[PDB]
Amino acid sequence: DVTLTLWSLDRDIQPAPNLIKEFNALNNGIKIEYRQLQFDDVVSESMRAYSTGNAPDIIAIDNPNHAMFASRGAFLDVTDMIAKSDVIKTENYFPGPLKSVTWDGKYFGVPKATNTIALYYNKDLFKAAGLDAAKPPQTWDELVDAARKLTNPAKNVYGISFSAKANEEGTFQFLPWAQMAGATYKNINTDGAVKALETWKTLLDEKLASPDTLTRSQWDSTATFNAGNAAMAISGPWEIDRMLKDAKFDWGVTLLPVPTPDAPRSSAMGDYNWAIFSKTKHPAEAFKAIEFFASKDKDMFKNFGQLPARSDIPVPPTGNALKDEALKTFVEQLKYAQPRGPSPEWPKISKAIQDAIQGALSGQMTPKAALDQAAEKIKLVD
Numbered sequence: 001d002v003t004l005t006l007w008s009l010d011r012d013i014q015p016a017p018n019l020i021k022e023f024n025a026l027n028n029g030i031k032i033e034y035r036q037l038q039f040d041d042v043v044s045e046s047m048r049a050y051s052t053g054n055a056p057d058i059i060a061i062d063n064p065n066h067a068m069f070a071s072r073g074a075f076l077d078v079t080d081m082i083a084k085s086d087v088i089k090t091e092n093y094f095p096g097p098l099k100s101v102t103w104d105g106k107y108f109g110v111p112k113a114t115n116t117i118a119l120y121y122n123k124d125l126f127k128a129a130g131l132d133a134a135k136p137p138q139t140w141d142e143l144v145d146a147a148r149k150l151t152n153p154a155k156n157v158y159g160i161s162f163s164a165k166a167n168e169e170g171t172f173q174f175l176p177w178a179q180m181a182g183a184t185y186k187n188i189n190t191d192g193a194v195k196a197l198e199t200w201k202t203l204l205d206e207k208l209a210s211p212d213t214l215t216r217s218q219w220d221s222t223a224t225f226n227a228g229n230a231a232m233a234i235s236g237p238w239e240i241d242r243m244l245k246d247a248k249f250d251w252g253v254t255l256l257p258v259p260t261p262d263a264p265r266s267s268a269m270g271d272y273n274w275a276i277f278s279k280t281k282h283p284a285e286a287f288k289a290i291e292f293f294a295s296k297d298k299d300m301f302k303n304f305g306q307l308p309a310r311s312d313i314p315v316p317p318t319g320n321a322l323k324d325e326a327l328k329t330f331v332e333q334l335k336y337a338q339p340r341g342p343s344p345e346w347p348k349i350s351k352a353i354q355d356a357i358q359g360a361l362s363g364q365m366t367p368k369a370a371l372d373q374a375a376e377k378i379k380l381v382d
């Protein structure tokens, strides 16, 4: 056999290792060895691997990081193999995910999946609070007020869970709030972004969200919602299949609340892309693996609760009512997602935003000063 190696963050529950086991069972003369990426310095580790000759054949890379690798020659130009393939057609893909694998008029990967974040809510806790579980909050004011009502320390319940972690988690979570209020990563210090960050300060200062929001991932925050310790959670569709098993209450999912009545919806485009490292010894076989993964996209939601990056395969209902309502909400919120970049310097942009969030939420800097600082850094890097 040709043996390939593949790196991804995906858990044993999530697509990559399962798709690999299925692929390997084909006995087609190619075998894939999986390694789950550890430690949250994926980008630097993977570039260092590439530079030293330790890179895998295939990686699932977060979409905002793609351009850094593509621009630096680390990824194989798959333009011609995509063209030749009938399994992978660029016309099948949503435009934002497709653009994220592109650099200088070439394709340097194939989208794996797409997502964004939305607002999960525990309908049983809404009901017990005297709220209307059919009417979740629509505006930031409503969201904060609901969170105040639902915060019940005597019962170990925070009103909301989210992530402000000093890595991509925090940037991905914060950008929707800034964007809805009129800002972007290219202009992150508008009055509306300050209001967004003041709103996050309210959630922490008033103890409506755990202090651990400053250091905890979206996945680990949402575990607290699933256990009944947070009444609402901002997270993505990657939570659904675990939530169905773990949450022992009735729940819904709605669009992210907007800053003033009828202000616009917005959020950041999530999820990963497949890529082949440029010095692979097995380019054709690596690409055939990716073709196999793409051929399973039609089953991704039903099997993993994740969403393909494709307009050719609109996602059908599963038959599970909670999951199917979640699907509706995420498909709707996805219509408002915006790309982080393209930028070969995304990590530096994101670090500036992370530091602003940490500075304001810790009380070390005012929200205005924190975001002004970020905007000056971003001007230089971007």
Ligand SMILES: OC[C@H]1O[C@@](CO)(O[C@H]2O[C@H](CO)[C@@H](O)[C@H](O)[C@H]2O)[C@@H](O)[C@@H]1O
Pocket: 126, 131, 132, 133, 134, 135, 136, 137, 138, 139, 142, 143, 146
């Ligand atoms: O946050 C939603 C929650 O707030 C209540 C009032 O406590 O309703 C508010 O939000 C609704 C949803 O947008 C509005 O229709 C309503 O006008 C507003 O007061 C609860 O009814 C609801 O569960």
Ligand SMILES: OC[C@H]1O[C@@](CO)(O[C@H]2O[C@H](CO)[C@@H](O)[C@H](O)[C@H]2O)[C@@H](O)[C@@H]1O
Pocket: 009, 010, 011, 014, 062, 063, 115, 168, 169, 170, 172, 218, 219, 236, 238, 269, 270, 271, 272
């Ligand atoms: O298996 C990967 C794991 O990462 C997640 C959640 O962290 O990635 C989402 O959130 C990131 C920020 O932490 C975004 O940058 C990324 O684009 C988005 O997909 C999940 O997808 C998944 O559980």
